[PDB]
Amino acid sequence: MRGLLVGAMQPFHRGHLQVIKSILEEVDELIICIGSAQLSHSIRDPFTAGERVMMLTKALSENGIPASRYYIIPVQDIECNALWVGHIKMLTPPFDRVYSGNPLVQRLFSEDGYEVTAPPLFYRDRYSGTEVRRRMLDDGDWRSLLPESVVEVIDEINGVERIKHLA
Amino acid sequence: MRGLLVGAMQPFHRGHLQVIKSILEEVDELIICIGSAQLSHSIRDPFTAGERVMMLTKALSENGIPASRYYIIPVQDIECNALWVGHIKMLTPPFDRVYSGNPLVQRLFSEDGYEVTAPPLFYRDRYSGTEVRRRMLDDGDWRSLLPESVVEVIDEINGVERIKHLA
Amino acid sequence: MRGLLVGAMQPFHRGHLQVIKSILEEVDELIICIGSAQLSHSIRDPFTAGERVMMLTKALSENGIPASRYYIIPVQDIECNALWVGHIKMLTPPFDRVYSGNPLVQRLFSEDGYEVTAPPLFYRDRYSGTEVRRRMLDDGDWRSLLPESVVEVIDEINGVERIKHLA
Amino acid sequence: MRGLLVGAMQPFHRGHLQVIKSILEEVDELIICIGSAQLSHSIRDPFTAGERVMMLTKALSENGIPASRYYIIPVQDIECNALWVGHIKMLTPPFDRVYSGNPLVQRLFSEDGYEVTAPPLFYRDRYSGTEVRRRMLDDGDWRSLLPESVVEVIDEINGVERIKHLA
Amino acid sequence: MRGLLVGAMQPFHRGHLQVIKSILEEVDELIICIGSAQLSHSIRDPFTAGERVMMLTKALSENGIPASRYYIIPVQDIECNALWVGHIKMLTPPFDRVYSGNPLVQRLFSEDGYEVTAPPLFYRDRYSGTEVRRRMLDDGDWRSLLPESVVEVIDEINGVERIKHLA
Amino acid sequence: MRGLLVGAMQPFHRGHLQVIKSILEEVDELIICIGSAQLSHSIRDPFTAGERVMMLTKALSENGIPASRYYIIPVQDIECNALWVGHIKMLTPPFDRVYSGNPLVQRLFSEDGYEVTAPPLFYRDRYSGTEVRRRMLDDGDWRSLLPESVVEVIDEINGVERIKHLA
Ligand SMILES: NC(=O)c1ccc[n+]([C@@H]2O[C@H](COP(=O)([O-])OP(=O)(O)OC[C@H]3O[C@@H](n4cnc5c(N)ncnc54)[C@H](O)[C@@H]3O)[C@@H](O)[C@H]2O)c1
Ligand SMILES: NC(=O)c1ccc[n+]([C@@H]2O[C@H](COP(=O)([O-])OP(=O)(O)OC[C@H]3O[C@@H](n4cnc5c(N)ncnc54)[C@H](O)[C@@H]3O)[C@@H](O)[C@H]2O)c1
Ligand SMILES: NC(=O)c1ccc[n+]([C@@H]2O[C@H](COP(=O)([O-])OP(=O)(O)OC[C@H]3O[C@@H](n4cnc5c(N)ncnc54)[C@H](O)[C@@H]3O)[C@@H](O)[C@H]2O)c1
Numbered sequence A, B, C, D, E, F: 001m002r003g004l005l006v007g008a009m010q011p012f013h014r015g016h017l018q019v020i021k022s023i024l025e026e027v028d029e030l031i032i033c034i035g036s037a038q039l040s041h042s043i044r045d046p047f048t049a050g051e052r053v054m055m056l057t058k059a060l061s062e063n064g065i066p067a068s069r070y071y072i073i074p075v076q077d078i079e080c081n082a083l084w085v086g087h088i089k090m091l092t093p094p095f096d097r098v099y100s101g102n103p104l105v106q107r108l109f110s111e112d113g114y115e116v117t118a119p120p121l122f123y124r125d126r127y128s129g130t131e132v133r134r135r136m137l138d139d140g141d142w143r144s145l146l147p148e149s150v151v152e153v154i155d156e157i158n159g160v161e162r163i164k165h166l167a
C-alpha cells in the first residue's frame, strides 16, 4: 500500500509534517513529490528543489520517521495539465492512493481514475507556504510555523536574505 | 561529506551496485541521480524513471545499505550541456565530490570547478547497460548481470516483453 | 478561396457558430483553428482540445454545414508571438483571408502581410467564452449561450462538474 | 465506434489509403492523426503538417469517403514516450480501437490499456514513406505509389524540388 | 576588464544610454545583453529582439561610442532562474563585473559569486520602459525619454501603431 | 544594403574569414549569426556561443574589419525548420540578401522569398569545421586552418583539451 502526496514545499512547514505523519498511519509507504522542481528565486517559489530536498530530509529524519517509509522525488511542472498525472506516474513507483488538498491535483487524479482523499487540515490559516513566506518578508513569526530542522536549513542557505532581497 | 553519482541506470546492474558500495566507504552520503528521467520505451532507455527508482530502492535495500546514506533523485536531460551541471545542483543537496566514469559528465563538472574521480570499473565488458539490454533482446544471460531484486522488478513490469516488442 | 479563423473555443458558443456561418458566405472553405490546444483544466481553458474538437464537430454538423467546407485543426500556443503566424501556416492548408476580432491575432497577421477582417459581433456581452464560463460557475443561464449539441457534449464530459471543482 | 490511426504521412501513399478504407469497414469513424506535425524540410519528414493535411483531404475526398467519417488532426511529437498516449487523447475525440503497424505505437497504447490491432499490410515493400521518398530523390517511379491527388499536391508545393535540394 | 549589463530594452531609453556611458568609464568593454529576446508584441515587451538590436546600434553609434567597446547579445529568457546566470555565461564573452538595478538579476549573480553593482539611477520616474510604453499608449511625451535615433527606429517599424493596436 | 550569413562557427576558420571579407565587398553590413548557440561540449559543437563570440571578435578585429560593418548575433536552434527563418528575423536587424553554402539554409530562405546566394568556397577540403575538429582530435595540423587570433582563444579556453577529453 503506497500513497502519493505532492506539494511545492515552499518551504516545508508543520502543516506538511503533521499531514505526512497522519497519512503514514494508513499507508506502508508515502511517495512525497516536490512539485515545481524547476522554479526558484521568486516570491511564490523561493527555494530550489535541491534545497527543499534538504528540508524534507532533515525534518522527517529529525522526527524519527524511517527513511525507507517514503520517497522524496522532485517533479518539474509541465505546460499540459492533461499530461501531468502521466508525468508523475512516469517519475514515481506505483501508488494506490492520492492524498491532496489541492483542487487541481484532486481533479486531475480523480479524472484519471485514482482514489483521492483530502486529509484534515492543521491550522490552515498558519500552516501554509503563503503565510510562512509572508512572515519571512514582513518580519513576522515564521520560525514557529516550521520544524526546527527546516529553520536551520533556511538559515544555512540564507533563505530569508534571498527572499527579502528579491522583494 | 556527500558524493554525487549520475547514471541512466537502464537498468541498474551489478556494476552500479559494486561501485556504489565502494564510494560509500569514502563518503558519508551518496546522491544517486537517475539521468534521462524523461526517456523511456526506446532501445537505449527502455525503463521509465519511476521504474528505475523501484530498481535502485529494491537493490540497495536488499543489500543492507541504510536508506539514509543516499538520495535517489531523477533528473531529466536538457538540451544545453553548459547548463547541465547547474541543472543537477538545482535539484540536489550540496555535494563535495563527483564520481563518474562518463567522459562528458567528468568534463562538465571538472570545468565547473568540482573534484571528479573515476572509480575502478567492475567487469566493464559485462556490467554495462548496453550489454544487459543486448542480452535481454538476444536471449543471452542477462539475469547474471543484475541483482536479484532488479530481476524481480524487471519481471513485474514486463521489461523484457516491452524491450523485445519495441525491437 | 479559403479563410482562416482562430479561437480558444472555451467552449464553442453561439457567437462562434453565427460568425462561422457568416464567413462561409464569402469563402469556399474555412480553416477553423482551435487555439491553446495544449491547455486544459484551468478557469480560462477548462476543456481539452480533443473535447473542443467534439464540440465543433457536433455543433457544425447539427447545423447542416457540410464537413467538407471546413478544417478543425488544433494549434498549441507558442512562447514567441513573432513565430505564431508561421506556426499556424505550418499546420494548415493555404489561406487567403484571416477573420478575427482578437487584437493580437489581427496585428500579427496584418504585419505578416495578410488581409485581416473583423466580422460584426453577435451579442458580444453574452456570446463570449468569459461570460459562458462565468455562468457555469455561478449557476447562471449558460445553456442559452451554446448550441444544444455543445451543451450535450459539456454534460457528457462533466464540464460543469470539472470547472466548479477547480474553482 | 471510433478508431484511431497515426502516421507521419510523409507523404500520404496508397498504403495509407488502402488501410484506411479497410478500417472504415469495421469502425463508424476513424481519427487520422498526422504525426510529427512540427517537423518539415528533412529527408525523413519533408512536408509540413499543413501540406500533409491537404494531401489527406484531396486523396480521401477524391476516393468518395465522406468527410464526416474521419478526423484529420496534426499532432506534434513530444520528448516523453510515456506521455505520448496522453498527448494523443488530449487532442482527439474519444476512441475505442487503435490501428497500427508501428511497434512503438502499438506498445504504448497496449500498455495504457487500449486494444490495438495491426491490419494486413499492402505491398509493404512499395507502399512506405521511405520507399516513396527514395524514389523521389533517385528519380524512380514514385507517382505509382501515390494517389493521383497526392501527386498533384506534391507538384503544387514543389515537393520533389525541395527534397532534392535538401539532399 | 569587461562588464555586463542586461535589460529588456523595451525600448532603449535615455536611462540606458546614460548608465551605459557611465559604466564605460570604469570598464574597457561592456557586454550589453538584450533580455527577453523571444518576447514581442505584448504591452510589456512590444518590440522584437531584432528591432531592439537596431535601437541600441543606432543610439550608441550616434553617441560616438566606438562599436568595439561593447557587445549587443540577445538572450532568450528561460524557465529556471537557477540556470539563468549559466545561460548568460554560455552566450557571452567572459566578464568580471555585473551592473544591475534589477533585484532578481543582482541576487542571481550575487549568489553565483559575481561582484554586482547598482549604478546611480537617472530620473527613475521618467527613464523606465514602463513609463515610455505608457506615454506611447496614452499620447504622452515619450519622444523626450528616448535618444533621437531610437525615436527614428520606432517610427520606421511603426512601434506606436503596433502597441496601440494590441491595447 | 545588409547581408546575412549563418554558421555554427565550430570553430571560426579561415574559410569563414575569407568568405566574410568577400561578402563585405558587395554589402554595407553583414549580420553574422552564430548558429546552435545552445549547443556545446559535443564532437560536433565543442565550443559555447560565448566562446565563439570571442573568436569572431578577435579574428575580425585583427583583420582590420571595422566592428560597425557587422553584427555577431547568437541564435539557438529550434525544432521547427518551418519557423527557423522567422526565428532569425525575430532576432536580427532587417536584411536584403542571404549568403549560404548550406542546402537547408538556402532552401528555407529561398522558400520564404529571400534572394540567397552561394559564394565560391575556399579550400572546401581544408576550411571546414569538420576537418578542423578532426585534426584537433587526431593531432593533425589544425592551427594552419584558423586565423592566429582564433588559435589564441582556443588555447585560452583549453579547447583541444576539452574536445580530446570528451572523445
Ligand atoms: N501541470 C502541472 O505542471 C501541474 C498541475 C497541478 C499541480 N502541479 C504542482 O503541484 C504543486 C502545488 O502543490 P500545492 O500548491 O498544493 O503545495 P503546498 O506545499 O502548498 O501544499 C501541498 C499539499 O500539502 C497538504 N497540506 C499543506 N498544508 C497543510 C496543512 N496545514 N494541513 C494539512 N495538509 C496540508 C495539502 O494536501 C496540499 O495540497 C506545484 O509544484 C504545482 O506546480 C503541477
Ligand atoms: N545535457 C544533458 O542533459 C546531459 C549531459 C551529460 C550527461 N547526462 C546524463 O547522464 C546519464 C548518462 O549516464 P551514463 O551513460 O554514464 O549511465 P550508466 O548507467 O551507463 O553509467 C553511470 C555511471 O555508473 C558508473 N558505472 C557503470 N557501470 C559500472 C561498472 N561496471 N563498474 C563501475 N562503475 C560503473 C560510471 O561512473 C558511469 O558513468 C544520462 O541520463 C545522460 O542523459 C545529461
Ligand atoms: N503566441 C501564441 O501562442 C499566440 C498569439 C495569438 C493568439 N493565440 C491564440 O489565439 C487563441 C485566442 O483566441 P480568442 O481569445 O480570440 O478566442 P475566442 O474563442 O474567445 O474568440 C475567437 C474569435 O471568434 C470570434 N468571435 C468570438 N465570439 C464572437 C461573437 N460573439 N460574435 C462574433 N465573432 C465572435 C472573434 O473573431 C474571436 O477573435 C488562443 O488559443 C491563443 O492562445 C496564440
Ligand SMILES: NC(=O)c1ccc[n+]([C@@H]2O[C@H](COP(=O)([O-])OP(=O)(O)OC[C@H]3O[C@@H](n4cnc5c(N)ncnc54)[C@H](O)[C@@H]3O)[C@@H](O)[C@H]2O)c1
Residues within 6 Å of the ligand: D006, D007, D008, D009, D010, D014, D015, D016, D018, D019, D034, D035, D036, D037, D076, D077, D078, D079, D080, D081, D084, D099, D100, D101, D102, D104, D105, D119, D120, D121, D122, D123, D124, D127, D128, D129
Ligand atoms: N513520443 C512521441 O512523440 C512519439 C511516440 C510514437 C510515435 N510517434 C509518431 O508516430 C508517427 C510515426 O508513424 P509511422 O512511422 O508509423 O508513419 P507511417 O506514415 O510510415 O505509417 C503510419 C501507419 O500506417 C499504416 N501503414 C503504412 N503503410 C502501410 C501499408 N503499405 N499497408 C498498410 N498499412 C500501412 C501502419 O499502421 C503504420 O504504422 C510519427 O509522427 C512519430 O513521431 C511519436
Ligand SMILES: NC(=O)c1ccc[n+]([C@@H]2O[C@H](COP(=O)([O-])OP(=O)(O)OC[C@H]3O[C@@H](n4cnc5c(N)ncnc54)[C@H](O)[C@@H]3O)[C@@H](O)[C@H]2O)c1
Residues within 6 Å of the ligand: E006, E007, E008, E009, E010, E014, E015, E016, E018, E019, E034, E035, E036, E037, E076, E077, E078, E079, E080, E081, E084, E099, E100, E101, E102, E104, E105, E119, E120, E121, E122, E123, E124, E127, E128, E129
Ligand atoms: N530566468 C530568466 O529567464 C531571467 C531571470 C532574470 C532576469 N531576466 C531578464 O532580465 C531582463 C529584465 O531586465 P530589466 O527588467 O531590468 O530591464 P530594463 O530595460 O527595464 O532595465 C535594465 C537595467 O538597466 C538599468 N537602467 C534602466 N533604467 C535606468 C535608468 N533610468 N537609470 C539608470 N540605470 C537604468 C538598470 O540596471 C536595469 O536593471 C528581461 O529580459 C528578463 O526576462 C531573465
Ligand SMILES: NC(=O)c1ccc[n+]([C@@H]2O[C@H](COP(=O)([O-])OP(=O)(O)OC[C@H]3O[C@@H](n4cnc5c(N)ncnc54)[C@H](O)[C@@H]3O)[C@@H](O)[C@H]2O)c1
Residues within 6 Å of the ligand: F006, F007, F008, F009, F010, F014, F015, F016, F018, F019, F034, F035, F036, F037, F076, F077, F078, F079, F080, F081, F084, F099, F100, F101, F102, F104, F105, F119, F120, F121, F122, F123, F124, F127, F128, F129
Ligand atoms: N531549425 C533550425 O534550428 C535550423 C535550420 C537550419 C540551420 N540551422 C543552423 O545553421 C547552422 C549550421 O551552419 P553550417 O552547418 O553551415 O555551419 P558552418 O560554420 O560549417 O558553415 C557556415 C557557412 O559558412 C560558409 N563557409 C564555411 N566554410 C567555408 C569555406 N571554406 N569557404 C567559403 N564559405 C564557407 C558557408 O556559407 C556555410 O554554410 C547551425 O547552427 C544549425 O543548427 C538551424
